[PDB]
Nucleic acid binder design. Structure first.
Lengths: 271, 46
RNA sequence: GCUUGAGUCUCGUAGAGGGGGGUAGAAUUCCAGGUGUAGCGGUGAAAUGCGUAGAGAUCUGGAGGAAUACCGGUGGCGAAGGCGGCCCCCUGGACGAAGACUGACGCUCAGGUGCGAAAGCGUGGGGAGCAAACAGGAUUAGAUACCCUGGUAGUCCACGCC
RNA sequence: CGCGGGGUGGAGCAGCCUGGUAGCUCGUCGGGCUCAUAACCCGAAGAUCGUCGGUUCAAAUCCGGCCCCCGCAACCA
RNA sequence: AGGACCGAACCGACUAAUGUUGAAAAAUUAGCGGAUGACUUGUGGCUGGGGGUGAAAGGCCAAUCAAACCGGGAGAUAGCU
RNA sequence: GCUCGCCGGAAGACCAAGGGUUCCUGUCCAACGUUAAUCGGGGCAGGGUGAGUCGACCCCUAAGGCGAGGCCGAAAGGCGUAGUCGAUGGGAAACAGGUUAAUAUUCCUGUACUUGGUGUUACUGCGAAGGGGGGACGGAGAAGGCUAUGUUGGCCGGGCGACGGUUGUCCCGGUUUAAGCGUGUAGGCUGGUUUUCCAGGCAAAUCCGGAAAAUCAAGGCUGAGGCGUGAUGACGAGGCACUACGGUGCUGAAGCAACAAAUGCCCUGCUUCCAGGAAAAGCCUCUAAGCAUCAGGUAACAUCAAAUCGUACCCCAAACCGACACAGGUGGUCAGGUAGAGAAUACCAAGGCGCUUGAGAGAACUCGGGUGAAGGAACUAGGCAAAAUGGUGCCGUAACUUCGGGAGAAGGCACGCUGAUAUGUAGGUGAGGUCCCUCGCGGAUGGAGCUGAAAUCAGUCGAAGAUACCAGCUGGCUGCAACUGUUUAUUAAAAACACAGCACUGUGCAAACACGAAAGUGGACGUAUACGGUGUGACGCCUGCCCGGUGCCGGAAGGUUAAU
RNA sequence: AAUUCCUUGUCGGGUAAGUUCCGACCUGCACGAAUGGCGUAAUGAUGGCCAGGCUGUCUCCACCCGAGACUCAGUGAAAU
RNA sequence: CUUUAAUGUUUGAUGUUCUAACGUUGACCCGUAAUCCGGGUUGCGGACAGUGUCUGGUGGGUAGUUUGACUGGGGCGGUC
């Protein structure tokens, strides 16, 4: 688990690694593995669109299974792979039919565990069944907005949605942000919260940790000149403006909600 | 110090090459002008 | 060597003993909604507060968190701190009966080690009620307080200090 | 020096920008209350407006001069 | 083990002298900092002018950048030399 | 020609990029060359670049471009599907020797090898843009085996010596050999073989995956290097012969062993860390459509073919880029001896070279250096510059602390040469012999030879033994920033910027936000333990009052309120 | 004080002598809590200050070796 | 007229329900060896959403511009 690192050089002093010995130390199962190229925060025009991100160490895209379309089929878990692309660790499932598929690993999962999908399967963590059959109040993850979509909500490590109430095809959800939102009963959801909850206790440490994490340094508005950002100028770090994003949109308390069409699903909003 | 011109025939033709000029109408119009002017080297090639 | 100290075994007895997991009901608060109209709340007395944007009262529904009424006791258990809904699981100690057995194995204990209310501190959660700090209102010669209307850490949970 | 703001019962503030007879709180004095003092209750007094001259019938007020207090400016090579 | 230590290639460019119609339109000589990394480099691609890119100096964009160069408007306009 | 000096991890030897004949040979000195110039990277003429195996082309693809249809756009056009381009990566094959005024892994002499085509013969189910395997990948570290290569001895040939000695433990030189073919070793990985079954790999599949059993426990793959052969060959010190007298022809000795040892190779291995680390085709295999007399495939043998372009020369520079024959700039490969830890440095080998003006003189002054009485920062804005310290082993080492540091703290000491311990030791290496073996590139025993530190002691020299080059100045108080980093190329390297961490705030996914008047991309093939923005800037102790101004968020009763 | 005008504030320390430096006092012209406050080990081609060593930096320069200057020969510029 | 009942009707608002316009960066199939695009079969929303014309607000994100003169130099001050 959490292992604070002995000081030896500066930038090592504050590091807290998260060791998970249980995770497989060998290479990934090859068939499921496509390349993932670095956008560097640039689009089709080539212009940068999002600042901060670029560079970083190379990584490949594991094709994780989301739809969980195989139903009624026993699936023995084999090993917990590390996935560089996400936060959560991904279990390498092996179905009775012989096919292997990666899946986000629920908290209580160990190698050799039996798990199954479909409308029947069971209440054991990691089984994916349509929410209509899930008991009221229980905790789930990898929820789908629409059937067959694959999964949307509660994918980040340690995250979990909590069902609250059911009415018609609709089913209320308490999202991790605390926002209530209805969804169709037919949607599938996986029982149990997602694993690697200690991800947030990682404290990277030296500056370089962020660099190869794929994030480039950020320059603050005040440092820049008037022409490069709404803030700037001054002979002595003067500020005197209301904080704004580089493109002039007000920040620090400005609502940005716009879709309107999706409002019927939302009930409470985050506070 | 290191100077501003560091030749690479490959890079030279990819950009100012004949077929790179045939790319868009802007390029072809260049050739239209250079012929009109009666210039010997139409574009860089050799 | 002995069994009269100490301990073990045999079947029982009571217990808010401890840890872990579930679960119930009443109430407070909040939110949506229905009826409904001018005060409510509070005080020694007031005001600050809330309320004609429809409050409080009242009725249905929901959501939360906390603590567990009555039983409850100059009752109980634990070495002490302490321990109160119901239930499951793991588990400690005491007490009795009838014996059987071991055969002084005992007593105290510097340094040592462990546990140790409440507050406090760390990391991450949660956050109803209450409530340091703080704000306002009074009361007073003044009042940095007692009293009143609000209110943050905190109180709660997991682990780690103290 | 350039300008602006003021000077008022014993103290602090009004009043003044619209020239017709200066108010508030505290302090003071006196009489009650108390064994006595404080606090509290009752009453009364005290300045006739920085200052020297104008103005107008009349100046706390408007104007100018002077004496203090307060703030701003007092720079460029 | 390490954005660890000393220090060459390598990269940087802190101090001083020379040089300032230079050997050179920013270098030399002696010392100087980094030197397994947020390193450095080859090749090839991508981003464009009120635009790019910027560990942010209004730096850099072909010896020029508080708005590139080239051609056109254009013999702009100049109460000024 | 002789001598002298300089580089020698280059100022040498090969390349790439880029140049485009500058290479070589004859001839000329008009100009060019910073002078002269018989010379030349100058002029003029002639000559010179040989490939199935090197490279390109070619097969395949990354990022990225173009893009039939298509979606989108006043038009030009933008985006992008199928496809198709695109190496800086992946894909079949050769070496040694000799040779030219100039070319060579291209010519010649040897000895090879690969991919096809076609035919013959013997056997046979072939066949895909489809399936699967493979190809196919990180960093760091550590050790063992090896080889290049060098050293020493041995062997062979030569020498015995200008001024003392020098036939001796003496001096000098040489002692080289490839690819391929065979052998399969160190060493690494991996449990095999058979039968049966299948919700899978978009269809099928004897392949792959998965599940059962049975059965044996070894089998297989991988592989440097060695050892044979290749090679009774070539090369070879030197002699023998003439010499356009520059050199060419003719002959040929030995050609081993041990030791040391790479950064190269085994090794894209092993161990380990997280930051978790290219695709695709060649290649192997599985069948479908399809075709079964075929066609086609497999093996063997023979025969033909293997096109086209580059190949000179320079290539850390006088030929590239800097207007120049310019103290600048530029990537890759090889990397000998002695000392040394070393690719530093000093002196040398290979190999180039003395920098295209010189010759005198020996003033001031300027540059670059050396040295200095006595004093020792009095200099000056300021110890700026100089000076000094400087290596290894050992001793010893404070305040403070985040308990790692601080710390090479500070401050000291020893250090050469000869001999003895030991007629060179501790170690390392490992022969001969002998023994064992389901016998070979085997294992034990055994110690020959070789190499070889470090220490103690004894003596001895000089003023000085880390003698040179090389090679920390140290300490105390204090500001600022936590730290490593980054920045104004060409006057500023900082106290600025970044930074991990912190907080606020936005965002429920067709997300916010950005680029594009649009389709559409990024965000992200991510999903509130995520992502955007703003501010502060590790860590410790903390973060107090004000919602009046301004901004944002929330509330809608009432007032005001546009087009219609 | 990287803020302090009056100012070389005042006192103390260090120097024969200190407008700087260190430590204190508080009248903070005009510090102050994330445009962060206050401490802080280590780090620094960072700012200030004091020691020891070291010396031509200096008192005061002296001498020496090299490259220029200078003379002869060849070639032969420039700003103005 | 007054105070107001219901039917019909003009349209007006609010709410509920439906789906056939429209959306679908849901699923599946076909062109098709193609996560583009089109077509279809669905399911999901649904007269909202989104787009056009008009219109109020906001709008240094962007652009064009103005910001006097005298003056014992000019700015400040004063003055026209």
């Amino acid at each position: 688990a959490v292992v604070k690192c002995k000081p030896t050089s500066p930038g090592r002093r504050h590091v807290v690694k998260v060791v998970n010995p249980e995770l497989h130390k060998g290479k990934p199962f090859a068939p499921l593995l496509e390349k993932n190229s670095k956008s560097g925060g640039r689009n089709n025009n080539g212009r940068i669109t999002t600042r901060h991100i670029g560079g970083g160490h190379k990584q490949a895209y594991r094709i994780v299974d989301f739809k969980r379309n195989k139903d009624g089929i026993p699936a023995v878990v084999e090993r917990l792979e590390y996935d560089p692309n996400r936060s959560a660790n991904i279990a390498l499932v092996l179905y009775k039919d012989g096919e292997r598929r990666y899946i986000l690993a629920p908290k209580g999962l160990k190698a050799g565990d039996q798990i199954q999908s479909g409308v029947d399967a069971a209440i054991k963590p990691g089984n994916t069944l349509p929410m209509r059959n899930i008991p009221v109040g229980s905790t789930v993850h990898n929820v789908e907005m629409k059937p067959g979509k694959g999964g949307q909500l509660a994918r980040s490590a340690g995250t979990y949605v909590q069902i609250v109430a059911r009415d018609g095809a609709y089913v209320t959800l308490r999202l991790r942000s605390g926002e209530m939102r209805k969804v169709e009963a037919d949607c599938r959801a996986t029982l149990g919260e997602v694993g690697n909850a200690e991800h947030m206790l990682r404290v990277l440490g030296k500056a370089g940790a962020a660099r190869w994490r794929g994030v480039r340094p950020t320059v603050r508005g005040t440092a820049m000149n008037p022409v490069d950002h709404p803030h700037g100028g001054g002979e002595g770090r003067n500020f005197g403006k209301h904080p704004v994003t580089p493109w002039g949109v007000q920040t620090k308390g400005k609502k940005t909600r716009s879709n309107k069409r999706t409002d019927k699903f939302i009930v409470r909003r985050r506070s | 110090m290191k100077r501003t011109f560091q030749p690479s025939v490959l890079k030279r033709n990819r950009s100012h090459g004949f077929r790179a000029r045939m790319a868009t109408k802007n390029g072809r119009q260049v050739l239209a002008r250079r012929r009109a002017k009666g210039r010997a080297r139409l574009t860089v090639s050799k």
